[PDB]
Structures are given as structure tokens and as C-alpha cells.
């Protein structure tokens, strides 16, 4: 219900990339984690995901310290991680994807698994392609399958790593409908991205890292008005 990073820090061979980055996301809200290229947005994002260990800081979900837990452990504690790369199981049916994700969850019986799987397939309009392997899907279809698979592990917070990775303007509205649907479905989505316009257009809040030591959290109108990010991150006057 409440994911929170506190004093996140990381260094690489005597070089400081991030130190004291603390962002917070709650259910039913979209939180962007933005910043200039090299500022440390993706480092702290990954350090919340659990693939990048912390040198200093804390990651908490509902009064549970997940700071030392790897990616599998933290994924069990309701942290779904959706990367930008093609993360579908190739040479497996979409149903096998869901079932592979379900058989690890000890919270359902042999039949409730299949029930939830069919519910997800009807939910994401991917009912057409049920037997097609992962090697034969298109763009949007594979994206929806990957979001369903990532939901099938029952995540309290979905961490999107660069979801706007080279998408035509005709499909960004579809991805925004999906992220609004996930927000309206009582999920906390943590979006890190390089595209600033479309990310700030859908994020209710946004933390703007810069040099990995400071942020400016606020609404899109409160972020656009701040002169610090207007200069270091934005430049002159921006046109949304």
C-alpha cells in the first residue's frame, strides 16, 4: 500500500552516483522518477526494484524493510517489476506465462490459478491470442501480455522501467489508458523514463533527481513552475 525509499545512496569505485535520494509512492497514485541524463534516476529506481544493492538507505512497503531483499524476495512482497526490454517468455504460450507466474504463489489452489489467468486474459483484451507463442506477438499484444504476467504475481506496486521506449504517438494513448487503468485498479505505479512530456502528463506526482543528491517533488503544474528544474532540467520556457 505504501512504498518508500529513504536516503538512497550508491557509489561505484570511489565515485558517487546517487546519495540521499528518498522518493515515496502510495496506492492509486502515479509517481514519476525523472531527472537529467546521468542524474541518478535509473540508479535509485533500480535500487528500489532490488536488482541494484543499496550502500545506504531504506526501502519499505507497509512497515516492512525490504532493503536487503533480492528481486525474487521483494517481488513476493508485492513489487512487480516491468522492464523496457522484451521480458516475455519466448517459445511459451501466454497461458504458460501466467501459470508459470502463478505456480510460485502459494496463495491459490490448482484451480483458482487458472481462474485468475482467464480473468486477466479477458481483462486485457488479449483473448484473441491465447495459444500463440511469445515469439509470434506484435508490439501492443506483447506489452499487454507482459503487464498481465507482471500482475499475476499479485503486486502492490508496479515499477515501470522506461515504459515509453520508442512508441508511435498512436500507441502512447493506449499505454496511458493502461497506466490509468492500473492506477484506477488500486496500484502504485513508479515510472522512470526519459520522455518528460508524456511522463509528466500522466504522473500525479514526480521526483526530479539531479546529480543524485536532491529532488523537487510535486504536481506537474508545481514542477513546471519551479525555476530550479526549469533551468537544470528544462531550459528557458517549456511548452507542454
Amino acid at each position: 500500500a505504501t512504498l518508500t525509499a529513504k536516503n538512497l545512496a550508491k557509489a561505484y569505485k570511489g565515485r558517487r552516483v546517487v546519495e540521499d535520494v528518498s522518493l515515496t509512492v502510495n496506492s492509486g497514485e502515479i509517481v514519476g522518477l525523472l531527472g537529467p541524463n546521468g542524474a541518478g534516476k535509473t540508479t535509485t529506481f533500480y535500487m528500489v526494484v532490488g536488482i541494484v544493492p543499496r550502500d545506504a538507505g531504506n526501502i519499505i512497503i507497509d512497515d516492512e524493510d525490504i532493503s536487503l531483499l533480492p528481486l525474487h524476495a521483494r517481488a513476493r512482497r508485492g513489487i512487480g517489476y516491468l522492464p523496457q526490454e522484451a521480458s516475455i517468455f519466448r517459445r511459451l504460450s501466454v497461458f504458460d506465462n501466467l501459470m508459470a507466474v502463478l505456480q510460485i504463489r502459494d496463495d491459490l489452489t490448482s484451480e483458482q490459478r487458472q481462474d485468475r489467468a482467464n480473468e486477466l486474459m479477458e481483462e486485457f483484451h488479449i483473448e484473441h491470442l491465447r495459444d500463440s507463442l511469445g515469439q509470434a506477438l506484435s508490439g501492443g499484444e506483447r506489452r499487454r501480455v507482459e503487464i498481465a504476467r507482471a500482475l499475476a504475481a499479485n503486486p502492490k506496486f508496479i515499477l515501470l522501467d522506461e515504459p515509453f521506449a520508442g512508441v508511435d504517438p498512436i500507441s502512447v494513448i493506449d499505454i496511458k489508458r493502461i497506466i490509468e487503468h492500473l492506477r484506477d485498479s488500486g496500484l502504485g505505479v513508479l515510472i522512470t523514463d526519459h520522455n518528460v512530456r508524456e511522463t509528466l502528463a500522466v504522473c500525479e506526482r514526480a521526483y526530479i533527481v539531479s546529480q543524485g543528491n536532491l529532488i523537487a517533488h510535486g504536481t506537474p503544474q508545481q514542477i513546471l513552475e519551479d525555476d530550479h528544474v526549469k533551468r537544470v532540467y528544462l531550459g528557458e520556457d517549456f511548452r507542454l
Binding site: 533480492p70 528481486l71 526490454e85 504458460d96 501459470m99 505456480q103 504475481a153
Partner: protein, 355 residues
């Protein structure tokens, strides 16, 4: 499970493809080498092909651990490279469950290779050798037409020709006593073996006693019996003797050598290595696992395949070196036959602790 089934399916397909490729390379090489000597007898291209096909089980048995390491590396590489082991972790499927999926799919492989090394590889190689000797000189019994010797305790025998498997010709028995000075020479023309009495029957024999100098009393008889510890099985082995035979037959022949009085360390070593071979297969898969989950985390395909091929090569080298190195200090042959598997397991487990 399902992830267990999917990992298993991909790793098994990739190990089988790798093994087919290594077997086809060594086969083309052995085919050209065998055709090189296809001038004598009615040995044609078809016959050289047949000798390679019948020898395929020996090649798969030899290239099994290398193909296991390479295929596991390429399988789990395609899984990692396509960012799927990360998804498995992103869904809660831990790395230990992935390692377990691999180990679970490692069981059919060891069963397959044991079955082959027991009934398919030795039978196939023996049939190939016999077919080659039959197409060139009219039988493997006619291939050993040069008179050979064998040892039974303090006695030696010389056989001039072999007429099948139960009938021998031209036998000469030099029986020495406990001091090498007391000798008797028993010659014979035909031998028969009956398992009912479990002895040999010689026809048209003549003995010579040499206890008394200046005498040479020679006695001639028509029917005699020879009670020795060798069997047509042992005759086939001493004819063939390439140390590539059935583990059961290898155990019987070791029991024959320890009874007759020879250094059976070579056969013991190859027996222990032929039964440790499926453990080496499993060690190789485990070392591939450790590579992917350790040093070779994010390396491209080329790095993985060249590190795989070099490690398989140094495993073959370790085996070929520590084979005879057992006789430097006369250490047990089982210890030497286990050293390649043990060392590669130790490397693999060292990479899974990382400290």
C-alpha cells in the same frame, strides 16, 4: 512445475543440439581417417560409413560432458540474454528454483548416458571393430591370426589361430613352477569349451617333462583336459583390448586380471571413469549454472561459447593427464578417474559461494 518444465525443455534441446554437432564433427574426422585405410579387403566407402555409425555411441559417450557444459551455457544464455531469468526473479521464482530446474532436468541425461555406456557404446564399438576386421581379413579371429600369448598364474600359453570363439588351434602351454626353473611344455591342436564342466578339452596333445636334464621324456596322448581361468569372453577382450567395453564386462575382466596376476590399474581407472562419466555430466551442467549466475552474468554469446569450449578442452586434458599420472606414485585408480570431475565440481562450487 512449469518454469521447471520450460527451463528443462530449453536446456535439453540445446544440450542435444550441441551433442549432435560435436558427434558429427568427430564422425566426419573418423570417417575420413577410416576411408584412408579402405584399400585392403572389400572395405568400401559404405563400410567406412558403417564403422563410423557403429562407433557413434562411443563419441557421444566421450563428448557428453563438454556438450553438457556448452549446451547448458547456451541454454541459460538464451534465457538470460532474452531477459527471462530476471523475469523469473521478478515473479518470485528464486535463482535456487532455477538451479533446481536445471538439476531436475539433469537426471534423464545421466540415465541416458549410463544406459549407452553399458549396452550401446561398447556393443556398438565391438561390432564396428569386428565388422572392419571381417570386411578386411575375414573375421576378427583371423585378424589375430598372428599367434598371441596369454598368462594364467605361473603358466603361459601361445595360441596360433582362433577358429570362432569356442575352438582354438595350435596351443602351446609353458608351465613354470614357483621358481621359474621347473617347466613343462604341453602342445595341442584343437581346443573346445563346455560351460557344463567349465574347463577346456584339448585333442591330440603331447607333454614334455624337463625336470630331468639329458632326458626329455615326451608323452603322447589323444585326449586331455586343460583347467585354466580364461573364458572366450576373456579371449575376446584380450584380442580387442581398447579399454572401451561394457562396465559389467570390464568388471569381469578386472576380476580375471586380479586372478591371473597383471597390473589391472588401467582397467580399474577406466571403469571408475566410465561410471563417473554421468557425474561429470552433472558437474558440467552445474558449472554452466554457476557461470551464468556468477562470472558470465552479462557476457555475449561468443564469450560464453569460447569459455565453454576452453573449459571442456581443459577437462578432456585433465582426464587424459591424470589417467596415467596415477602410476607416478601408484595411487588408487579410482582417485585418478575422479580427479577431473572433482576438480571441476570444486571450481563450480567455488563460483557459487563467491567468497
Amino acid at each position: 512445475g512449469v518454469l521447471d518444465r520450460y527451463i528443462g525443455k530449453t536446456i535439453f534441446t540445446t544440450i542435444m543440439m550441441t551433442l549432435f554437432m560435436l558427434v558429427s564433427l568427430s564422425g566426419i574426422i573418423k570417417f575420413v581417417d577410416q576411408l584412408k585405410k579402405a584399400g585392403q579387403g572389400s572395405y568400401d566407402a559404405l563400410g567406412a560409413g558403417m564403422y563410423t555409425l557403429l562407433s557413434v555411441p562411443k563419441d557421444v559417450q566421450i563428448f557428453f560432458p563438454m556438450a553438457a557444459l556448452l549446451g547448458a551455457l547456451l541454454g541459460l544464455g538464451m534465457l538470460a540474454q532474452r531477459s527471462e531469468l530476471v523475469v523469473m526473479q521478478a515473479s518470485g521464482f528464486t535463482r535456487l528454483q532455477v538451479a533446481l530446474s536445471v538439476m531436475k532436468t539433469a537426471i534423464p541425461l545421466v540415465l541416458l548416458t549410463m544406459a549407452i555406456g553399458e549396452w550401446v557404446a561398447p556393443q556398438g564399438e565391438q561390432m564396428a571393430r569386428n565388422y572392419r576386421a571381417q570386411a578386411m581379413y575375414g573375421g576378427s579371429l583371423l585378424s589375430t591370426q598372428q599367434g598371441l600369448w596369454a598368462k594364467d598364474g605361473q603358466n603361459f600359453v601361445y595360441i596360433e589361430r582362433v577358429k570362432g570363439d569356442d575352438e582354438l588351434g595350435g596351443v602351446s602351454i609353458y608351465a613354470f613352477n614357483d621358481e621359474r626353473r621347473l617347466q613343462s611344455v604341453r602342445h595341442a591342436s584343437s581346443a573346445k569349451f563346455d560351460p557344463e564342466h567349465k574347463q577346456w578339452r584339448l585333442s591330440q596333445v603331447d607333454e614334455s617333462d624337463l625336470t630331468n636334464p639329458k632326458q626329455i621324456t615326451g608323452s603322447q596322448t589323444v585326449s586331455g583336459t586343460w583347467k585354466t581361468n580364461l573364458t572366450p569372453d576373456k579371449l575376446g577382450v584380450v584380442a580387442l583390448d581398447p579399454d572401451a567395453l561394457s562396465i559389467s564386462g570390464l568388471h569381469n575382466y578386472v576380476k580375471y586380471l586380479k586372478s591371473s596376476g597383471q597390473d589391472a590399474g588401467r582397467y580399474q581407472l577406466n571403469m571408475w571413469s566410465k561410471i563417473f562419466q554421468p557425474m561429470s555430466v552433472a558437474v558440467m551442467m552445474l558449472m554452466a549454472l554457476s557461470f551464468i549466475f556468477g562470472p558470465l552474468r552479462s557476457v555475449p554469446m561468443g564469450v560464453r561459447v569460447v569459455t565453454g569450449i576452453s573449459f571442456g578442452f581443459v577437462f578432456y586434458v585433465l582426464d587424459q593427464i591424470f589417467g596415467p599420472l596415477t602410476l607416478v606414485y601408484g595411487i588408487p585408480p579410482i582417485i585418478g578417474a575422479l580427479l577431473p570431475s572433482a576438480s571441476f565440481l570444486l571450481i563450480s562450487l567455488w563460483l557459487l559461494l563467491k567468497r
